[PDB]
Amino acid sequence: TERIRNVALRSKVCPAETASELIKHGDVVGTSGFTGAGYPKEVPKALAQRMEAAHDRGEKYQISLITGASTGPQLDGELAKANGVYFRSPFNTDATMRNRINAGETEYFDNHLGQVAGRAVQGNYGKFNIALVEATAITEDGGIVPTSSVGNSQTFLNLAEKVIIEVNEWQNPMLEGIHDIWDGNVSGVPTRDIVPIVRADQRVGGPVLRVNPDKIAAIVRTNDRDRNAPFAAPDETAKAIAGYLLDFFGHEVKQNRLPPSLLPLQSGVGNVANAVLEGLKEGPFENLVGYSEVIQDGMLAMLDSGRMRIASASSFSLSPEAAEEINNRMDFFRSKIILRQQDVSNSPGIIRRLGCIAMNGMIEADIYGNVNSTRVMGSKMMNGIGGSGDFARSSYLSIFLSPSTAKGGKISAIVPMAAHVDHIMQDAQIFVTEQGLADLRGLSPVQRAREIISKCAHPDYRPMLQDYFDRALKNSFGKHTPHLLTEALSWHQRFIDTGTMLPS
Amino acid sequence: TERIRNVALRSKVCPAETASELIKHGDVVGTSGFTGAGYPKEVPKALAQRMEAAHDRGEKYQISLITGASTGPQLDGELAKANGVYFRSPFNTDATMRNRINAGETEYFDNHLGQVAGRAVQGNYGKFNIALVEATAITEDGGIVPTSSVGNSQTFLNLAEKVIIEVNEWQNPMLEGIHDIWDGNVSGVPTRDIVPIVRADQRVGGPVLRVNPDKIAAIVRTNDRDRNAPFAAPDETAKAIAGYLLDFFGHEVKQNRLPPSLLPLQSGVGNVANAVLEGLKEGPFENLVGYSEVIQDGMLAMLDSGRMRIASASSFSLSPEAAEEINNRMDFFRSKIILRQQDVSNSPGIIRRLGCIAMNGMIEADIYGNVNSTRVMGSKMMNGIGGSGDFARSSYLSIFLSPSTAKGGKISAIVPMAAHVDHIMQDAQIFVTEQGLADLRGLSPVQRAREIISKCAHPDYRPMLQDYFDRALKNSFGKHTPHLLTEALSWHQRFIDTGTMLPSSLEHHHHHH
């Protein structure tokens, strides 16, 4: 059938190439796109080709690119290859863009995801010249139906001088109805409105993004797919991690520190997460509820098994198999999923009110339980902080999960001092590795260290950590959080120098 | 007249020493007390004495002490002197207690102030045996009127097995009515209640703390003053910082990024604050509003002048001459002030909704604008994170202010890498020192560094900082946040070893050329 149901807006249809010409060197461009879902695809490719051409002619041609979160090859990839992004925010997972960032070729700032809309309204990224947004359809009354994520799209539409819409036939038409877009003041000028959400399942808005049709300068009909998560399954390391956490939850319920149905669940991006969700799929906790940033394979499975009743998120992140599963049964799943603006899904006010349990991955933690989520050796960007801070600090319980080692045992995920900190001690109560679980609630830093070292550290590294800690306790400037500054970062330098943190 | 207006409770009145006997070795004790205001005084003194006696006889006697925030000499001081505290949370400014913490004699964890109540209810500190709370009065129906702070007192009252009240006749009776205590679910079991505050001057509750009178085991009549620590008159460094900040505010207003009345202001604990507040009282900005953790001298002044229309906080933080002024006019100041539970004053939902401007001190920041508020050389506690995280992360604008050097120039407040992090780059947008102001909005880390180094760092240190940065850019494992791990913490180690961050010219340093 026809995706552009507003007749007058059909007159605005044009080629991706023509549309890209609307984007000028220096422009700030806000796009849809979150966890590889729902980003614009055709216009960016054409922009990319035109950028390389201009460069070869000695013509400066770059943009600032603000998204919901991560995109995909068509967007971050192509623009990165063309060397056409001078600034990027707030979250990337594309390899080429990552290389531009780590080479100092593209400036990057990974804002808390729930804050981006507000900072954009404040003007932190500059004036938005363009909003480039992917849509499933356009309603008769000119509503824009989003695709597989909401992200920041409503805000970008509000802000931008000109609007380009990509309407993508690839996206399932039955997405229409799944989203909840609130017309309230969440990220606008203070004083903001109270967001009246008191239950994860509660809808407070409507199914479409709103925009003034006068701002729409081009509509481009497209047909191309989102990225998929890898299908692969959780290994023995992940399963052990899931096992410790599930036992922990069990003991909390017995002590009456959690209800039998737990609390609204936030599961982060990563593979350790899927182990946990798979664990919960066949777990003893019924009538679960998700209040997260993303719907991954694991959550989809739990909605399937009925072990989870409903899930709130801003986006999808699904394997091709999971994607197929949902696109066949969209009517079933649609009644169990709510996609929200990311400034609502990641609202600290709402997260705390609902009492979410936050479960996130990490690069590394130090012995005191400070967490690095982002910067390897302190300087090389992986993905970004994303929403891990939004959730960790606001949660009822903040949990970080990781293999105790990386790179085949050549790196310890528990270190004397983190090379970069994303989450301070105060924002992390529980740590889990395949070695065990450390419950840090109510503990001082020295007490946190004893737990983390004995429970979580790999046997190969535990004695080295105990050696560091003992000598710090003896020789540190202060004894509240004992360190030896001459060796605090020495394991990282050793990896840099030798390829392993294990001494020779 | 009587401060205890409920007849039935009068029979529970007893001497401080006797009340203190209710507190046993190993007890978890929650007390009133926030920034030198409203903490209990006589019972802790008596308790300290008995602890010392037990110790002298080889008998153990220590408590876990959980407060609103910092207390004063009568409580933190006396107990630390007696070595009577095995665990302390969440915030302390007493020098003796600080020494116990830094020697490893008292275990310490500085929780975000707005989260303490919820973590207590969750059971993180264990079961509360005693709540010890200072009061102005007890009402006819048994309500407890708090004194110069609210803090966590309501939560401690709810949780504790037994309750002790100190009724302090030094505290002005006209404090009654200044407090706003909510029966709503702010820090209890989820799902919590919506906290419906949509203006800084809005009251949502009532004037008294509520407690089952059956739990009140003792009441002590007292008469002793709060720790009205001395007014630190702003020096030229502080004034310069304030000048740059006020110029910034003026600019934001001129560019229509702030209303002429600014937005609700949070001013952190510290000495740079007085400069800022003094600057604001002379400034061009009218109809100001405070939504803060504390009310300090500078705020009282603007309330008196009408420059500030209302001030919301959990506590007072006044100089003796400031307690003096307000005492003579509590009648007047009571209509300009609202004292709230700290889980409400420091609620991230509310702070964001109101759009607070956060202004906080710091120990140090690295060139990328990560902030240390707590741990000198990374291991020695100063005060604690307090509510700086509550406010920094939730604010409309997050501003950190500090002298560019410390220890008479022997330490640079801008460093290659912070020795400890309290506020990540994402939580800090504006930096101000006496050297200038760095506006970091929309910048990548490398861009942040160029601004911080050029605007904020002291001239004595900027060449060294630029040298680090330049060489990191060339050599760092990654170029997103360039570091040289061999040197990152070397200025701190130089200070530990030699008492200065400055290099000795007797040896090479790449910036010396």
Ligand SMILES: *SCCNC(=O)CCNC(=O)[C@H](O)C(C)(C)COP(=O)(O)OP(=O)(O)OC[C@H]1O[C@@H](n2cnc3c(N)ncnc32)[C@H](O)[C@@H]1OP(=O)(O)O
């Ligand atoms: S929406 C709310 C939550 N959002 C976030 O948490 C955003 C930030 N978090 C993330 O980016 C991921 O959670 C990270 C922290 C990268 C971990 O992801 P995983 O859970 O999938 O863990 P993996 O073991 O699979 O690691 C993935 C890649 O990261 C590398 N890595 C992990 N740990 C280290 C250490 N200590 N040192 C170096 N590298 C490390 C892994 O090597 C892996 O990368 P590869 O390129 O595949 O080797």
Ligand SMILES: CC(C)(COP(=O)(O)OP(=O)(O)OC[C@H]1O[C@@H](n2cnc3c(N)ncnc32)[C@H](O)[C@@H]1OP(=O)(O)O)[C@@H](O)C(=O)NCCC(=O)NCCS
């Ligand atoms: C960080 C903090 C101590 C700074 O206080 P300040 O009055 O603004 O700054 P000052 O320059 O006067 O220095 C205060 C102390 O810190 C020390 N200090 C400051 N910077 C230092 C540095 N870079 N290295 C070593 N010591 C430093 C000073 O020497 C002084 O210590 P002293 O009493 O032993 O002489 C203070 O703001 C604080 O404790 N913050 C945490 C709580 C908070 O921010 N709450 C917010 C809501 S109220």
Ligand SMILES: [Cl-]
């Ligand atoms: Cl809200």
Ligand SMILES: [Cl-]
């Ligand atoms: Cl805790």
Ligand SMILES: [Cl-]
């Ligand atoms: Cl709320």
Ligand SMILES: [Cl-]
């Ligand atoms: Cl920003």
